[PDB]
């Protein structure tokens, strides 16, 4: 681009969107579980991964990953979601926070307890 072309039309910066739009620049959002189910991951991996469809306070219906071994969530459970993509699940851009609101901590966890909402034994 010539100097004179930049004067006529400056360098336009790219408008980089959020990877986590349903949070609306909040560190967490509360929501109600509309469905709680399992989903098979993308090709290279295999599992039945625990997920829930969550209706957030701001009205965004999103899918959230339920980390850790075992969970107590059902339809109409009230949960807190954070940001966090799960690579091998299409569309899963949010994690459920364990040990917050209706979502229990993981049973018998001893390492990374703070990530799974588990009190010190």
């Amino acid at each position: 681009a010539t100097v004179n072309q930049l004067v006529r039309k400056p360098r336009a910066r790219k408008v980089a969107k959020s990877n986590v739009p349903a949070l609306e620049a909040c560190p967490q959002k509360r929501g109600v579980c509309t469905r709680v189910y399992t989903t098979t991951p993308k090709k290279p991996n295999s599992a039945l991964r625990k997920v829930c469809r969550v209706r957030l306070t701001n009205g965004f219906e999103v899918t959230s990953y339920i980390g850790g071994e075992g969970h107590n969530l059902q339809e109409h459970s009230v949960i807190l979601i954070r940001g966090g993509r799960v690579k091998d699940l299409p569309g899963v851009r949010y994690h459920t926070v364990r040990g917050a609101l209706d979502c229990s901590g993981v049973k018998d966890r001893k390492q990374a307890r703070s990530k799974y909402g588990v009190k010190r034994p």
Binding site: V3, N4, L6, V7, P10
Partner: protein, 78 residues
């Protein structure tokens, strides 16, 4: 004392002219010297100035909605 020099671009108003004051400013980002134009409505009591004339003007009190500049002299006739 304080005057601008510019060129008459209209004379169609009674006792009033539009005067274009050309400025040569370095562009803030790119550094190229650009031509910028300030247009001023100017009071011309006698209706002496025609289009194309170069005129010296000075700032005065408000004379109309848009006029706050008055003719000092015609520098060059067109």
């Amino acid at each position: 004392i304080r005057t601008l020099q510019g060129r008459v671009v209209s004379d169609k108003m009674e006792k009033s002219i539009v005067v274009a004051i050309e400025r040569f400013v370095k562009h803030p980002i790119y550094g190229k010297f650009i031509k910028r134009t300030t247009k001023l409505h100017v009071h011309d009591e006698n209706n002496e100035c025609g289009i194309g004339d170069v005129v010296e003007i000075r700032e005065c009190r408000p004379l109309s909605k848009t006029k706050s500049w008055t003719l000092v002299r015609v520098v060059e006739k067109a």
